[PDB]
């Protein structure tokens, strides 16, 4: 439950957590990646 029944995921995105203790975002639509959730635009 405690990390498997949390709130809904963002639209058409993936979100991962590295062994360094940091969080990253992944766009399957263009194979792009980023450190945060910025405005839509240039890479």
């Amino acid at each position: 439950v405690s990390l498997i029944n949390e709130g809904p995921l963002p639209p058409g995105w993936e979100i991962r957590y590295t062994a360094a203790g940091e969080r990253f975002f992944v766009d399957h639509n263009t194979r792009r990646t980023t450190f945060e959730d910025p405005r839509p635009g240039a890479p």
Binding site: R16, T18, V26, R31
Partner: peptide, 15 residues
């Protein structure tokens, strides 16, 4: 944003 870390590579690693 300076500070190199573990690079995120999902689809870009499994291809």
């Amino acid at each position: 944003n300076t500070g190199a870390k573990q690079p995120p590579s999902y689809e870009d690693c499994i291809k």
